[PDB]
Amino acid sequence: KRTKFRKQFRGRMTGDAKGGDYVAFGDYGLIAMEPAWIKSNQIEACRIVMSRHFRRGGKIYIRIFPDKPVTKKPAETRMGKGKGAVEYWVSVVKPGRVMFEVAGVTEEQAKEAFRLAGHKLPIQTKMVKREVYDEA
Amino acid sequence: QLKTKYNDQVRPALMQQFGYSSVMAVPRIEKIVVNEGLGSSKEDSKAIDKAAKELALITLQKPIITKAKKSISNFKLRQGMPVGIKVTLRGERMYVFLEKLINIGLPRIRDFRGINPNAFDGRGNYNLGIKEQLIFPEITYDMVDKTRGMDITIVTTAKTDEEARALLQSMGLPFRK
Amino acid sequence: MELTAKPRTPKQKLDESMIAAVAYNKENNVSFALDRKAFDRAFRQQSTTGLFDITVEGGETFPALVKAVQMDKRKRAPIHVDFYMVTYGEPVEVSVPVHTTGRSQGEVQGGLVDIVVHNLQIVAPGPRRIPQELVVDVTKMNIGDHITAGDIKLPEGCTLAADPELTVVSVLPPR
Amino acid sequence: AHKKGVGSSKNGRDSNPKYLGVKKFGGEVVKAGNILVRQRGTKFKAGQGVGMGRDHTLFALSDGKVVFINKGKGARFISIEAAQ
Amino acid sequence: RRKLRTRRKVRTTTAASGRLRLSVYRSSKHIYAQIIDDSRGQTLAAASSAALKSGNKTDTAAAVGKALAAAAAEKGIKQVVFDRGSYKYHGRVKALADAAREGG
RNA sequence: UCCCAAAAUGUAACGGAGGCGCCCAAAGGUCACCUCAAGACGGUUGGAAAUCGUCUGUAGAGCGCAAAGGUAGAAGGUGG
RNA sequence: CACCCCCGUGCCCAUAGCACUGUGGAACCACCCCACCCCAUGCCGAACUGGGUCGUGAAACACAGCAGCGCCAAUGAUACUCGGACCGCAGGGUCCCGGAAAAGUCGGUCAGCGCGGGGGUU
Ligand SMILES: [Mg+2]
Ligand SMILES: [Mg+2]
Ligand SMILES: [Mg+2]
Ligand SMILES: [Mg+2]
């Protein structure tokens, strides 16, 4: 969710994935296919939903942590400088990236644990399976 | 006044216990020291005197006030402030004091019983943690100040503690069996 | 896998379903360019612990091994492949996957067993006889049973490159 | 007065004019006096025939041709392989 | 340890100098009062105490210094420089020194 | 002094961070010499660190203050 | 550069470094020995230093083996991009044309090159 301590601010830019593996920590995983900002509350909205579906196992890996502070409008003005260090924290995701990947539970019993998680995401994803063997 | 039996009792008896391709290679005694880390709990630009004066009349040498590492940790700590003391012995004065210890030091210790075994400086070097200085052939309460303690270091070319222990004791040393 | 071409220029393939790999050892690092589909259907099975027929256009069957494959992101599709020609008595080192069999005594119990490390690497495989898999006991494993390299029975010879006390599978607790 | 701080913390006004760089590159017919490199630390160390200002700068003692030498980085050297 | 010889050696300027440096391995009793020229790793003169010593080795001190200054002459050298080492310009070494620092 | 500044320089904003209006008869000139942080094992008031000791040790320390570059063959640490 | 090795001093300055192992001794080196004073360790001649064997090669060193770690490091394909030409409301993305990494893989090596002095080939 929210980081523990840091610097305080940032900026904005994009270009395709870079460190989003594939299989690892599980057999089934969910992959993001579009450039976006993933709100930390948009992850909970995913995890939590996923939990419910899984009556146990917790074999859910969320490997897209919010390494980013965004700001906002103190109400209107414009005559002041940097604003709202605290609007919210997001975690820039890029295509091919892997935010989710369950483990242990049946295909179907997974093709749903994701589907749902998809429904609260600002981007389109697609489920991936195996044959992932680069580095280890 | 020692050294022959040093070699002898040790060296020979060593090969006659070991098998050293040389006389040089056998473990020896590099140096014996005395750290006097007093003060800190006792800021006595007075007591500092008790130390050296004494330490010196017991080792026959002027030691160095191993001042503060400039460390100023939360508690009582600061820049480089006199806190402890260093007194390095080696060879003559080493041996001259050394023998005292093996003869009168520990031997003359009420409550004394010998000395723990368990290897120290796995570097074949022995460590000696002393305390009450009230067991010295040179310390006098009827001509001192207050009363303190001290630590002495055993330095030896002793490669392994195996060889260490041996040498250690051969030259003379009380082990609590 | 009848790969035929092998030039720096791939216009003649990039449009036409054809992957593009390279092979070698220390002698010949022949430029290459095999067919999409084929490799695609191929590597699936033999994976990287499977040497296959490499008769390049002209006919010169060669023995190699799937070393490293780098596929496109966004599109699960593979783009490049490295074939490290087989050997005879020694290749280098290989990647062999860990597998389980038989229900574990932790599953029905109250928890689920987890495979801390999917594919495992052992020192020296042994060209000609390199484990195209690795089934492992799990049953015994209860509520916190971790298995490691110092356990897994190896195929007569093969030595474990992976540090021993390293857990390959444990049976994770419930919830 | 009151009972708060003097100036409002968390500001951003100001920075500095600043400079530094390389005044004479490799192959330039340096000269007596010419400055060839302004730097902060010892990025480039006064090679052969180069003096070194107090501000880690570098200059020519004589005339000749500017020359650069980079030994695996870490230590750099500007020299002067005069023509004459 | 090796800091010392590199401290002296370094400070001892090379080409900016033009002059020549005279070493000395008087840590042992087998000195070498060597003389080398800046660039080319070439030793010109040289006057140890290797060819015998007549018993003197800490003693042959100035013998070699005088044996050297004298030496150079058969090369003709006006300017040289003492690239001593860890050796802190004391006696055994000041020997070769003063000795040569006049034998020439 | 950092970042913004788009690998030369330069480059704005009520853009993002932080310091200065000093200090040092020596914290200087020169000449000698030493070399760090830290962990581990073993040792006395000690017992968390700290003092002593022994291994490891590009220095992960230091450099009077803010940062950056720089630096151990010392700009780091003592004495004449 | 007759063959060798040893000592000093360079270039080079990790593909020349480490570690593990073996080789060397009385030519050289070192340890070792004593050291009142020359000069000296804010205490210790441990280190600087003065006077010298024997003994040793153990340590330090030199050399040689080894590549387990370091360090070096392809090719191929990719990232990215100068230039040209397009797409999507936008985040962003593409084609043609050159340039072209980093990481990883193959594999590479435990240097190589000088000057001078010493002692050997009984
Ligand atoms: Mg690399
Ligand atoms: Mg072009
Ligand atoms: Mg363009
Ligand atoms: Mg292109």
XYZ file of N, CA and C in Angstrom, chain B residues 8-141:
402
model
N 63.121 -24.846 26.249
C 63.141 -26.189 26.820
C 61.766 -26.767 27.156
N 61.331 -26.553 28.393
C 60.032 -27.056 28.837
C 59.008 -26.967 27.711
N 59.058 -25.872 26.959
C 58.120 -25.690 25.872
C 58.686 -26.267 24.571
N 59.330 -25.427 23.757
C 59.892 -25.870 22.477
C 60.136 -27.384 22.390
N 61.223 -27.888 23.015
C 61.512 -29.328 22.971
C 60.270 -30.156 23.290
N 59.845 -30.092 24.549
C 58.666 -30.819 24.994
C 57.566 -30.695 23.957
N 57.575 -29.593 23.216
C 56.573 -29.396 22.177
C 56.834 -30.405 21.076
N 57.927 -30.251 20.338
C 58.208 -31.230 19.307
C 58.035 -32.604 19.957
N 58.393 -32.698 21.236
C 58.261 -33.954 21.971
C 56.830 -34.036 22.498
N 55.899 -33.669 21.622
C 54.470 -33.656 21.910
C 53.843 -33.340 20.549
N 54.605 -32.590 19.752
C 54.227 -32.151 18.406
C 55.260 -32.669 17.394
N 55.484 -31.882 16.346
C 56.440 -32.242 15.315
C 56.653 -31.044 14.407
N 57.354 -30.036 14.927
C 57.610 -28.812 14.173
C 58.815 -28.874 13.252
N 58.557 -28.721 11.957
C 59.606 -28.745 10.951
C 60.660 -27.686 11.277
N 60.361 -26.837 12.260
C 61.288 -25.782 12.661
C 61.203 -25.416 14.132
N 62.151 -24.582 14.554
C 62.222 -24.076 15.928
C 61.485 -22.742 15.918
N 61.507 -22.096 14.759
C 60.836 -20.822 14.577
C 59.307 -21.001 14.606
N 58.827 -21.943 13.792
C 57.406 -22.275 13.660
C 56.639 -22.597 14.944
N 57.333 -22.950 16.023
C 56.624 -23.275 17.258
C 55.938 -22.042 17.847
N 54.735 -22.227 18.426
C 54.013 -21.095 19.020
C 54.839 -20.414 20.115
N 54.719 -19.097 20.193
C 55.469 -18.345 21.182
C 54.610 -17.296 21.882
N 55.258 -16.312 22.494
C 54.548 -15.269 23.214
C 54.923 -13.876 22.708
N 54.120 -13.333 21.787
C 54.386 -12.008 21.216
C 54.342 -10.867 22.222
N 53.277 -10.797 23.013
C 53.180 -9.729 23.999
C 52.026 -9.836 24.989
N 52.253 -9.278 26.172
C 51.265 -9.257 27.248
C 50.941 -7.788 27.553
N 49.646 -7.458 27.593
C 49.202 -6.083 27.837
C 48.293 -5.895 29.051
N 47.929 -4.637 29.294
C 47.070 -4.255 30.416
C 46.167 -3.056 30.078
N 44.928 -3.312 29.660
C 44.011 -2.211 29.350
C 43.343 -1.656 30.616
N 43.443 -0.343 30.806
C 42.853 0.267 31.981
C 41.643 1.185 31.733
N 40.612 0.621 31.099
C 39.396 1.364 30.798
C 38.560 1.806 31.993
N 39.144 2.657 32.828
C 38.457 3.185 34.002
C 37.561 4.370 33.599
N 37.457 5.363 34.488
C 36.670 6.558 34.210
C 35.260 6.373 33.674
N 34.838 7.291 32.803
C 33.498 7.270 32.203
C 32.418 7.227 33.277
N 32.442 6.183 34.097
C 31.489 6.034 35.198
C 32.128 6.786 36.365
N 33.424 7.044 36.199
C 34.218 7.706 37.214
C 35.112 8.763 36.582
N 34.565 9.965 36.413
C 35.317 11.083 35.830
C 36.205 11.726 36.920
N 37.354 11.095 37.173
C 38.306 11.563 38.182
C 39.663 11.923 37.580
N 39.831 13.188 37.194
C 41.110 13.639 36.665
C 42.082 13.407 37.820
N 41.547 12.792 38.882
C 42.281 12.429 40.095
C 42.677 10.950 39.991
N 41.657 10.096 39.878
C 41.842 8.648 39.789
C 42.703 8.222 38.599
N 42.645 8.996 37.524
C 43.447 8.673 36.361
C 44.876 8.422 36.860
N 45.271 9.184 37.886
C 46.603 9.089 38.506
C 46.819 7.724 39.153
N 45.811 7.283 39.907
C 45.840 5.989 40.589
C 46.368 4.957 39.587
N 45.782 4.993 38.387
C 46.131 4.099 37.281
C 47.635 4.035 36.965
N 48.041 4.755 35.922
C 49.437 4.791 35.487
C 50.429 4.550 36.629
N 50.503 5.508 37.554
C 51.386 5.414 38.716
C 51.454 3.949 39.097
N 50.283 3.398 39.388
C 50.183 2.009 39.764
C 50.589 1.084 38.618
N 49.730 0.970 37.610
C 50.007 0.126 36.456
C 51.499 0.082 36.168
N 52.129 1.251 36.219
C 53.559 1.379 35.950
C 54.463 0.707 36.987
N 54.020 0.680 38.237
C 54.807 0.076 39.304
C 54.503 -1.407 39.405
N 53.638 -1.870 38.509
C 53.267 -3.270 38.496
C 53.681 -3.909 37.183
N 53.947 -3.086 36.170
C 54.391 -3.606 34.868
C 55.754 -3.005 34.525
N 56.103 -1.947 35.257
C 57.366 -1.241 35.072
C 57.349 -0.614 33.683
N 56.338 0.233 33.461
C 56.146 0.921 32.187
C 55.071 2.014 32.275
N 55.231 3.072 31.486
C 54.254 4.166 31.458
C 53.257 3.806 30.352
N 51.967 3.692 30.687
C 50.947 3.341 29.690
C 50.272 4.540 29.018
N 49.458 4.266 27.991
C 48.732 5.326 27.282
C 47.244 5.363 27.620
N 46.754 6.569 27.860
C 45.358 6.766 28.189
C 44.534 6.548 26.921
N 44.170 5.298 26.628
C 43.388 5.025 25.417
C 42.055 5.786 25.389
N 42.188 7.076 25.093
C 41.096 8.036 25.017
C 39.909 7.644 24.128
N 38.762 8.254 24.426
C 37.509 8.010 23.718
C 37.617 8.027 22.200
N 37.032 7.010 21.577
C 37.024 6.850 20.124
C 36.305 8.016 19.472
N 36.077 9.066 20.254
C 35.366 10.241 19.774
C 33.885 9.866 19.748
N 33.615 8.619 20.126
C 32.259 8.092 20.183
C 31.522 8.860 21.272
N 30.299 9.280 20.979
C 29.505 10.033 21.940
C 28.096 9.428 22.090
N 28.007 8.097 22.037
C 26.721 7.395 22.149
C 25.738 8.067 23.122
N 24.446 7.768 22.954
C 23.387 8.341 23.791
C 23.883 8.669 25.204
N 24.209 7.627 25.960
C 24.693 7.795 27.319
C 25.979 8.594 27.371
N 26.559 8.626 28.563
C 27.794 9.339 28.806
C 28.825 8.898 27.766
N 29.046 9.755 26.767
C 30.007 9.516 25.684
C 30.382 10.859 25.082
N 31.521 10.949 24.406
C 31.937 12.236 23.846
C 33.018 12.091 22.773
N 33.710 13.185 22.443
C 34.773 13.137 21.430
C 35.875 12.180 21.896
N 37.128 12.583 21.730
C 38.219 11.738 22.178
C 38.549 12.097 23.617
N 37.972 11.385 24.572
C 38.247 11.715 25.953
C 38.893 10.570 26.699
N 39.969 10.869 27.442
C 40.657 9.829 28.203
C 39.585 9.003 28.876
N 39.690 7.689 28.737
C 38.706 6.792 29.321
C 39.365 5.514 29.811
N 40.267 4.975 28.995
C 40.950 3.744 29.362
C 42.459 3.863 29.289
N 43.171 2.745 29.398
C 44.614 2.836 29.310
C 45.269 1.625 28.674
N 46.310 1.896 27.889
C 47.070 0.864 27.194
C 48.503 0.780 27.738
N 48.955 -0.447 28.005
C 50.307 -0.701 28.507
C 50.858 -1.961 27.841
N 51.572 -1.792 26.734
C 52.116 -2.938 26.021
C 53.449 -3.448 26.538
N 53.498 -4.765 26.746
C 54.678 -5.476 27.225
C 55.054 -6.455 26.127
N 56.348 -6.715 26.015
C 56.869 -7.624 25.009
C 58.346 -7.934 25.268
N 58.647 -9.224 25.395
C 60.005 -9.644 25.653
C 60.404 -9.608 27.122
N 61.389 -8.763 27.418
C 61.931 -8.603 28.761
C 60.857 -8.211 29.756
N 60.419 -6.959 29.670
C 59.391 -6.463 30.569
C 58.164 -7.360 30.467
N 57.928 -7.922 29.282
C 56.796 -8.823 29.101
C 57.056 -9.975 30.057
N 58.110 -10.717 29.752
C 58.520 -11.864 30.544
C 58.732 -11.563 32.031
N 59.380 -10.434 32.331
C 59.638 -10.034 33.721
C 58.341 -9.882 34.516
N 57.335 -9.270 33.903
C 56.048 -9.119 34.571
C 55.353 -10.482 34.485
N 55.341 -11.036 33.276
C 54.723 -12.324 33.016
C 54.987 -13.307 34.142
N 56.262 -13.615 34.356
C 56.660 -14.560 35.391
C 56.010 -14.212 36.739
N 56.015 -12.925 37.095
C 55.405 -12.498 38.351
C 54.028 -13.138 38.426
N 53.195 -12.796 37.452
C 51.840 -13.318 37.343
C 51.768 -14.837 37.550
N 52.512 -15.587 36.740
C 52.517 -17.045 36.830
C 53.050 -17.519 38.179
N 53.762 -16.641 38.874
C 54.343 -17.016 40.153
C 53.584 -16.455 41.347
N 53.414 -15.139 41.362
C 52.750 -14.456 42.462
C 51.357 -13.904 42.124
N 51.150 -13.491 40.871
C 49.856 -12.947 40.484
C 48.712 -13.835 40.940
N 48.276 -14.700 40.028
C 47.193 -15.648 40.274
C 47.457 -16.549 41.477
N 48.670 -17.154 41.550
C 48.993 -18.034 42.681
C 48.617 -17.323 43.980
N 48.905 -16.021 44.040
C 48.564 -15.223 45.208
C 47.239 -14.550 44.944
N 46.175 -15.347 44.991
C 44.828 -14.847 44.783
C 43.850 -15.555 45.701
N 43.353 -14.842 46.707
C 42.384 -15.433 47.615
C 41.154 -15.668 46.738
N 40.523 -16.829 46.901
C 39.338 -17.201 46.117
C 39.763 -17.735 44.739
N 41.051 -17.600 44.428
C 41.606 -18.078 43.163
C 41.354 -19.583 43.097
N 41.272 -20.124 41.879
C 41.016 -21.555 41.694
C 41.666 -22.128 40.426
N 42.165 -21.238 39.569
C 42.784 -21.648 38.317
C 42.218 -20.746 37.246
N 42.116 -21.222 36.006
C 41.559 -20.402 34.915
C 40.771 -21.182 33.842
N 39.628 -20.633 33.445
C 38.793 -21.259 32.427
C 39.595 -21.752 31.225
N 39.139 -22.858 30.598
C 39.785 -23.463 29.423
C 39.323 -22.789 28.128
N 38.142 -23.203 27.679
C 37.494 -22.714 26.468
C 38.226 -21.627 25.678
N 38.787 -22.058 24.545
C 39.543 -21.218 23.618
C 38.999 -19.822 23.473
N 39.915 -18.874 23.333
C 39.564 -17.474 23.159
C 39.934 -17.110 21.725
N 40.742 -16.065 21.530
C 41.164 -15.674 20.182
C 41.451 -16.949 19.382
N 40.427 -17.458 18.688
C 40.572 -18.669 17.897
C 41.827 -18.588 17.062
N 42.494 -17.445 17.186
C 43.732 -17.123 16.494
C 44.926 -17.711 17.254
N 44.631 -18.653 18.145
C 45.680 -19.275 18.927
C 46.149 -18.342 20.027
N 45.500 -17.188 20.154
C 45.885 -16.248 21.195
C 44.972 -16.333 22.391
N 45.556 -16.158 23.561
C 44.772 -16.246 24.767
C 44.372 -14.871 25.252
N 43.250 -14.841 25.955
C 42.724 -13.606 26.489
C 42.648 -13.759 27.995
N 43.056 -12.722 28.723
C 43.014 -12.778 30.178
C 42.211 -11.640 30.780
N 41.040 -11.992 31.299
C 40.177 -11.005 31.916
C 40.397 -10.952 33.413
N 41.186 -9.984 33.854
C 41.459 -9.840 35.271
C 40.423 -8.908 35.905
N 40.466 -8.818 37.234
C 39.560 -7.962 38.001
C 40.319 -7.331 39.183
N 39.788 -7.512 40.389
C 40.397 -6.991 41.609
C 41.921 -7.000 41.533
N 42.526 -5.815 41.622
C 43.985 -5.689 41.582
C 44.569 -6.007 42.956
N 43.693 -6.446 43.853
C 44.085 -6.790 45.206
C 44.615 -8.209 45.231
N 45.677 -8.434 44.459
C 46.347 -9.737 44.374
C 47.639 -9.566 43.591
N 48.210 -8.371 43.727
C 49.452 -8.022 43.052
C 50.630 -8.002 44.005
N 51.811 -8.397 43.499
C 53.046 -8.422 44.287
C 53.659 -7.016 44.265
N 52.858 -6.048 43.816
C 53.296 -4.658 43.720
C 52.210 -3.651 44.165
N 50.953 -4.099 44.222
C 49.824 -3.240 44.630
C 49.733 -3.131 46.159
N 49.631 -1.905 46.686
C 49.547 -1.689 48.145
C 48.421 -0.753 48.590
N 47.451 -1.292 49.331
C 46.320 -0.493 49.817
C 46.735 0.436 50.959
